[PDB]
Amino acid sequence: YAHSQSLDRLMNPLIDQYLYYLSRTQSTGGTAGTQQLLFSQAGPNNMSAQAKNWLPGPCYRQQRVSTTLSQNNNSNFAWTGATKYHLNGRDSLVNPGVAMATHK
Amino acid sequence: ADGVGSSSGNWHCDSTWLGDRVITTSTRTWALPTYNNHLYKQISNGTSGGSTNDNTYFGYSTPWGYFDFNRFHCHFSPRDWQRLINNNWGFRPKRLNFKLFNIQVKEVTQNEGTKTIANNLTSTIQVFTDSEYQLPYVLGSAHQGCLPPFPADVFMIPQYGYLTLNNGSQAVGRSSFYCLEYFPSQMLRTGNNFEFSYQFEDVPFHSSYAHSQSLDRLMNPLIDQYLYYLSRTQSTGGTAGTQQLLFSQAGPNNMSAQAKNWLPGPCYRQQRVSTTLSQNNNSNFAWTGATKYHLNGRDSLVNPGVAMATHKDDEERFFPSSGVLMFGKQGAGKDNVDYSSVMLTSEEEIKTTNPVATEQYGVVADNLQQQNAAPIVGAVNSQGALPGMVWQNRDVYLQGPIWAKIPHTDGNFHPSPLMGGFGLKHPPPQILIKNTPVPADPPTTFSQAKLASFITQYSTGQVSVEIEWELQKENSKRWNPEIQYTSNYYKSTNVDFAVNTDGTYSEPRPIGTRYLTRNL
Amino acid sequence: PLMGGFGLKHPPPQILIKNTPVPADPPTTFSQAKLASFITQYSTGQVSVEIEWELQKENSKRWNPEIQYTSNYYKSTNVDFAVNTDGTYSEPRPIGTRYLTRNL
């Protein structure tokens, strides 16, 4: 199955949170930039700033290859630019690897 | 039997402390309006407006409302909280019981400027509990709309909505749309009442205590170790620096060099912010210098984050930017409210087992040394979990969330909520409620279109929720006195956790659960 | 008690009563603040209280007559312990409980 909700979006779009985050560390709009700690409640406007009970799965990066040939760099990076793991003096290509979304 | 003139239930608020069980019951009075004029509505936000790419969403806002009892202070009085956190190591819920009763549905109309309200005795409401977990479970995000802390407050029931997969403001093919009327619900008139019971799945006791020993100090201060470490790689004191491998046994003199069976919990660094303004850098780094996680092309601030000590010894002024739970004081603004209005919680008690939020996890070597090449050590800012690694979970508060739903997924690691709480796979089923729409007079000639004119209507009533708890009694041979939660002995303009002159209830400070001690 | 009475360690439990608040129409858009607008409302009814008493009968060999509480024999504008023309009840004098005699 595929999830019908992303992990970060489990929130209610209608209601604000009672929790606060650090929104602004600087005086805004004034002739001076005197640092001041301002707090705010996250809500439908900023959902990137809300607090969340969970995190995404673990990440082990891979190199990005485009099917379009003109975009990829001109060289052979298949083995060299690869993501490998070093066990007992032998570099082993990491294949297929940890489950990670193919592309955004 | 029941009718328009006989009440559906009785008021219950009380706490029964019996042995290891504490049974807390509560009751409030609510009012459920008519949201969206009895309509589901698509809601979305795109990046084509002023919004950025991280803030986009797509979802629906339903006419239904929902009950949220998911904060602790809904269920505990500050004195019942003091009996809990002072006298017990751990507590977990066992079962709950829930009731709606005394349902008053009222029609309200407008004639010129005057307003008038009247009972509608035939009207109904609709209530179902989603006990198969077949809906977006929107509790546990720490939204407003919970029962008030104070039993004499009347609260408005929040609107139910949910978000679904999007691309920009647009929706993708996997986007689900749910019609809440497509479930069986129970329709209640003013004589009817509602009830259900629920039984929590086994969960580890929330550990409420601070360790009396740091993780690195578990050693005996008196006796040396039979193990050796590499103390000195160079000839000492001689006219030459000829490298020589010298070994030593660690002991009371050097305890930083001893061998240890365990490691601190995992570290994901936060940015350090000082309450003193002169120390912080002059710029706005709140969002930019933040610690974020990148999921599907959207940067999401990491809040509150993994449990990590707020600050080290003798620094109370520094706190991690996104790290600490932040509660607002009574009557505080929603946006850009000054520091003195929020209440910053702090984790002092987990400094023993857990690393400080604003500092590195440790140091590793970056290179293979040679006689030519000097050894180089890098910093470990983010460290996942390794074997032989122990940590403490984040602390619950009187104001904070009780539980969370563990997402249904192939795998999880330590499924305990990051805000603190009890991670549940089958959490308490969310309860949905709505005013059954009553049409205004239709035309006398048939029309295919749906009826767009309704009677302005809302309902009120009484709700009760009773949770049985399981306590772990504190059994300890410590000689000296503990640290207890005590109210301020000195005089004040008004009592804390009590009404002011104007009747406004207020909670002056966040109250964590760990005052007791154990041995690490 | 120094005012006179029966000092009780567990006196009759005080009875408290209140009108359950009924809210005026809330707004159609959710708000965190408590509901400040109520329906003006009051209640009425009937209350009954019935007390059983224990008497100590007077048993005395005194020859001559006691002193009794007697209403004024002489005429008056209106009866004592009864309504006046306007319906106002009134109690003309305080009445103590000690008219009987005993031997000290």
Q: Residue B26 is inside which H or E element, if any?
A: strand B21-32
Binding-site residue ranges of B: 55
DSSP state of B267: E
Integer Cα distance of A101 and B297 in angstroms: 11
Q: Considering only the C-alpha atoms of chain B, give the largest distance between any 2 of them, rounded to a whole number of Å.
A: 113
Q: What is the bridge-based pairing of β-strands B210-211 and B362-365? A: unpaired
Alpha-carbon gap: B266 to the closest alpha carbon of chain A (Å): 13
CA triple B65-B69-B73, angle to 5 deg? 140
- Decide: B405 and B424 in contact? Cβ < 8 Å: yes
Cβ-based neighbours of B252, under 8 Å, separated by 6 or more: B221, B222, B224
Residue B106's closest chain C neighbor by CA?
Answer: C25
* C-alpha atoms less than 13 angstroms from C-alpha of B132 in its C-beta half-sphere: 4
CA B111 to chain centroid: 46
Structure tokens at B263: 């490691």
**Burial label, B86 (beta-carbon count in 10 A; 0-12, 13-18, 19+):** middle
Cβ-Cβ contacts under 8 Å between B and C: the total is 47
B interface mutation test: which of C25, C28, C31, C39 has the most B CBs within 10 A?
C25
Chain B residues whose beta carbon lies within 8 Å of the beta carbon of residue A33: 282-283
Integer Cα distance of B84 and B473 in angstroms: 10
Instruction: Say yes or no: A1 contacts chain C, CB-CB below 8 A.
Output: no
Integer Cα distance of B304 and B209 in angstroms: 21
Integer Cα distance of B30 and B431 in angstroms: 14
Instruction: Say yes or no: B336 contacts chain A, CB-CB below 8 A.
Output: yes
Cα–Cα distances in angstroms (integers) from residue B134 to residues A52, B67, B137, B159, B426, in the given order: 21, 17, 8, 18, 11
Structure tokens at C82: 């009864």
Integer Cα distance of B358 and B269 in angstroms: 6
> Of A35, A36, A48, which is closest to B300 when you measure between CB atoms?
A48
Task: Determine, for residues C23 and B34 on separate chains, whether the beta-carbon distance falls below 8 Å.
Answer: no
Resolution rounded to one decimal, in angstroms: 3.0
Chain A residues whose beta carbon lies within 8 Å of the beta carbon of residue B52: 48
SS3 string, B290-314, reads CCEEEECCEEEECCCCCCCECCCCC
Alpha-carbon gap: A43 to the closest alpha carbon of chain C (Å): 13
B interface mutation test: which of A7, A12, A86 has the most B CBs within 10 A?
A12
User: What is the C-alpha radius of gyration for chain C, rounded to an integer number of angstroms?
Assistant: 26
Paired with B120 in beta bridges are none
Residue recorded with tokens 């500050």: B78
Task: Determine, for residues C21 and B154 on separate chains, whether the beta-carbon distance falls below 8 Å.
Answer: yes
Nearest to A42 by CA among B341, B337, B155: B337
Instruction: Say yes or no: C33 contacts chain A, CB-CB below 8 A.
Output: no
For residue A68, count other CB atoms closer than 10 A to its CB: 7
Alpha-carbon gap: C45 to the closest alpha carbon of chain B (Å): 15
How was this structure obtained? cryo-EM
- Decide: B474 and B516 in contact? Cβ < 8 Å: yes
Q: Considering only the C-alpha atoms of chain A, give the largest distance between any 2 of them, rounded to a whole number of Å.
A: 61
- Decide: A17 and B144 in contact? Cβ < 8 Å: yes
Nearest to A54 by CA among A15, A102, A5: A5
Residues 136-165 of B with CB under 8 A from C: 144-145, 148, 153-156, 158-159
Instruction: Say yes or no: B106 contacts chain C, CB-CB below 8 A.
Output: yes
Instruction: Say yes or no: C83 contacts chain B, CB-CB below 8 A.
Output: no
